[PDB]
Design a protein around this motif. Structure first.
Motif: not given
Ligand SMILES: CC(C)(COP(=O)(O)OP(=O)(O)OC[C@H]1O[C@@H](n2cnc3c(N)ncnc32)[C@H](O)[C@@H]1OP(=O)(O)O)[C@@H](O)C(=O)NCCC(=O)NCCNC(=O)CCC(=O)O
Ligand SMILES: CC(C)(COP(=O)(O)OP(=O)(O)OC[C@H]1O[C@@H](n2cnc3c(N)ncnc32)[C@H](O)[C@@H]1OP(=O)(O)O)[C@@H](O)C(=O)NCCC(=O)NCCNC(=O)CCC(=O)O
Ligand SMILES: CC(C)(COP(=O)(O)OP(=O)(O)OC[C@H]1O[C@@H](n2cnc3c(N)ncnc32)[C@H](O)[C@@H]1OP(=O)(O)O)[C@@H](O)C(=O)NCCC(=O)NCCNC(=O)CCC(=O)O
Ligand SMILES: N[C@@H](CCCCC(=O)O)C(=O)O
Ligand SMILES: N[C@@H](CCCCC(=O)O)C(=O)O
Ligand SMILES: N[C@@H](CCCCC(=O)O)C(=O)O
Lengths: 274, 274, 274
Positions: A166, A189, C203, C217, C260, C263
């Motif tokens: 959303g 998702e 996540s 890590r 972070t 988001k």
């Molecule tokens: C954890 C995150 C916030 C990402 O962290 P960030 O944006 O602060 O950090 P990044 O710099 O992008 O990532 C740091 C490292 O982690 C990795 N990484 C981050 N998130 C990742 C993910 N989801 N998958 C894989 N790797 C990830 C990055 O690739 C990066 O790699 P590296 O450092 O080795 O080079 C994001 O992935 C995440 O999980 N966000 C939450 C998503 C979520 O749950 N949203 C809710 C959905 N919204 C809705 O409205 C749903 C509605 C419903 O379902 O009903």
């Protein structure tokens, strides 16, 4: 729409100071009108134009404001009660309207007012939030969720337990979009304005957000934010530089083919009759 | 059953031309009878015979036809309304029947008519679709889904958010089957006629379909379509030939043991009393 | 509380022999009182004391006993019926009480009696089971589940399809705990008394149980049972000794930062007004 767009963008700036009591009749009637249009399909939050999806931010603003202008009310469930401020879309429908509207709503599927449901869709028990748009022939399978302002194309199959992001909480810039003819596998998702291009097949347990690497094993190219039309995507991992661990990623293993089509087809017999 | 099987297999061939209006009284009464038997447990879509599960295709056909012969009707929710063509199994039950039937139904758990629920089961809020069979002592935990025609053994524990594949959309050859005494971990999914053999333990977030490799790290053997009895399965990945990436797979890490049993036991105190 | 704790611990020993018919008036009134206190927030199953979470086992015992002392009753849904023995928390509330209590309950969100919901929370359609405690400002997003006796901190965001482990089945020693200010990503699961320390970000599609390796890590340190405060966790895998396959694990990739925070923020405009 300027007569509405204007009042809307004015209030949004004062969002934190508006409340269901101090809100002026003008702004109230307007937000109300705008929500009624989204509910109709007459207006929609994001649209594809010149082959680019564009977000109408003022419309996201009105969705947001509705939460500042309306007050909660007790809603009577049968065995329990609820207290919320967004009406139920179907509470006033009768058979005539359902017949006229042409979709199927399986109990206890629920949809908020301000969401658009197109003809020939089937909603298994699931949730469709305010401002969303669900196009023709699409099926929303059990426990799936179509997030606020999300855009779902025609003939799409959202499998069981699928979640489409959303824009309300966490707050998002752009809605999530799934183009026409896509199939989203069980418990996957798609969030944070990622775009799944038409005719794509996402496997089960695939999680796509802005930080997800969509790796094309063929070309070696890594995508972010979008799934190129006609891809078949599955879960995988990419190894660390030292190879001491690996992290999640989405892998494009191939282009949709007959074999794939065999497993993801829409069942026309379940759709609307005549 | 030949008196029913016959009419049934006749109509199926004409499936696309049948509609709730043009359907003849015969075919209507028959499909109706067949659904009433599935609902009773008197008939079931798949059965194990001579130690092999077998699918009765004519029974899948009748399930399908019910969608061509019945018309939608408005169903009155409390705060909202629904429009669908498959009745609610429990809508006519009273305490006597519930007492006699011996299972527990937690609001807002929902079950379609044509599905069999056995004595001593507990349905947390979840969904059981038409033609499914849920055997004795099984618990269907929160937001789980038992797909159309799926077969669930006795004393099985389907954890939260678990999905068991149906056969309606996408259309499937064979139902999905979970044998007796299995435990399926939270948010896992089993689809496409895969068979989980008795006494197996599937961990959380495990996704099993026909294309999923079930890798036995001990023997090096890779299974497809079935989980050998008594296995403990968890998520993993297998590396590409070049080792440049890896893809999802299910890994059999061991045979169920006391240690495992400690984490997956059924709680008898929650079951039916006397 | 000794006047209650006593009767309670006495009966538990006789758990298998108690039934809704043979139970003595004393024990019945007591379990009843204890459930009413949990429902109030006056008592809670686990508490942090001297910076350590502690479980009050006698309170888990009373939750368990309620299932031995109460009998099922038909609950009237609108389009269907239910048969269960735990009352609906909100069935007796009126606008005054909802207004006074200060949270939002979105249909068809459901909560069992004996669960505590704090002021300023928003329950999207979801489930909160008996004995759970949900603290101030928290949002439980669509299809999420707060398991029996689970403890959710203030300002937490449980995303869509998230599951927080209970203690009833399978039977568990300690409840699952999510501290203040945490964000749990869509379709993730936290079970078996694992503790997610405050301000952490999990996540999407992350599955944490006692056997899950939480790999840092940076330091090379592997955690079990807990997520160190302020971590950002994502799915990954660790390679076998021979490197012939890899298995699932949770990876701490970094400490929460502005990026972070961008988001995962809570939307105050959705919370309670004045
Ligand atoms: C954890 C995150 C916030 C990402 O962290 P960030 O944006 O602060 O950090 P990044 O710099 O992008 O990532 C740091 C490292 O982690 C990795 N990484 C981050 N998130 C990742 C993910 N989801 N998958 C894989 N790797 C990830 C990055 O690739 C990066 O790699 P590296 O450092 O080795 O080079 C994001 O992935 C995440 O999980 N966000 C939450 C998503 C979520 O749950 N949203 C809710 C959905 N919204 C809705 O409205 C749903 C509605 C419903 O379902 O009903
Ligand atoms: C994506 C698939 C369709 C498979 O693609 P396909 O069958 O066209 O291609 P395949 O040739 O099998 O696979 C191509 C490569 O991808 C890999 N692959 C494909 N699917 C995979 C998967 N799910 N996991 C891992 N690898 C997979 C293959 O192993 C193969 O490897 P390689 O090419 O390197 O040798 C399938 O895996 C899939 O995801 N199907 C959808 C499952 C689903 O969501 N079903 C809905 C459930 N049905 C219900 O009724 C649920 C009800 C409910 O939950 O309520
Ligand atoms: C499968 C388990 C039972 C673990 O198996 P076990 O405890 O008997 O074995 P272990 O010795 O711990 O593991 C054996 C190997 O498998 C690995 N392994 C086991 N479980 C694993 C897991 N979940 N992830 C990764 N690896 C795992 C171990 O690390 C170990 O590695 P190795 O052998 O190579 O050294 C556990 O992981 C699991 O999946 N438990 C079920 C969790 C679950 O679904 N719970 C239900 C949630 N409860 C609720 O109330 C939810 C409520 C709701 O959501 O509504
Ligand atoms: N993650 C969800 C939360 C919706 C909140 C709706 C409400 O508060 O009523 C979304 O952004 O759509
Ligand atoms: N994937 C699901 C879809 C069910 C559709 C039921 C309906 O249209 O009423 C299944 O095959 O069971
Ligand atoms: N896994 C869940 C099962 C709850 C059963 C509740 C009931 O039988 O009424 C938990 O432990 O919370």
């Amino acid at each position: 729409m300027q007569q509405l767009q204007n009042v809307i963008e004015s209030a949004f700036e004062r969002r934190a100071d508006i409340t269901p009591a101090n809100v002026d009749t003008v702004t109230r009637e307007a937000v109300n009108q705008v929500i009624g249009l989204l509910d109709s399909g007459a207006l929609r939050v994001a649209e594809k134009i010149d082959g680019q999806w564009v977000t109408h931010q003022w419309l996201k603003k009105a969705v947001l404001l509705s939460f500042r202008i309306n007050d909660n009310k007790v809603m009577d469930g049968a065995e329990t009660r609820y207290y919320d401020k967004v009406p139920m879309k179907f509470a006033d429908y009768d058979e005539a309207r359902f017949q006229k509207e042409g979709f199927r709503v399986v109990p206890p599927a629920t949809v908020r007012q301000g969401a658009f449901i197109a003809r020939n869709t089937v909603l298994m028990p699931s949730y469709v939030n305010i401002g969303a748009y669900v196009d023709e022939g699409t099926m929303v399978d059990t426990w799936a969720t179509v997030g606020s302002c999300a855009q779902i194309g025609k003939n799409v199959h959202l499998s069981g337990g699928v979640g489409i992001g959303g824009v309300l909480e966490p707050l998002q810039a752009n809605p999530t979009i799934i183009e026409d003819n896509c199939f989203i596998g069980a418990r996957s998702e798609v969030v944070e304005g990622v775009i799944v291009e038409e005719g794509s097949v996402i496997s089960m347990g695939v999680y796509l957000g802005q930080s997800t690497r969509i790796y094309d094993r063929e070309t070696g190219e890594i995508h972010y934010g979008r799934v190129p039309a006609g891809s078949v995507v599955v879960s995988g991992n990419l190894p660390s530089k030292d190879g001491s661990y690996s992290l999640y990623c989405a892998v494009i293993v191939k282009k949709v083919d007959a074999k794939t089509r065999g497993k993801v087809g829409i069942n026309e017999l379940l759709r609307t009759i005549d």
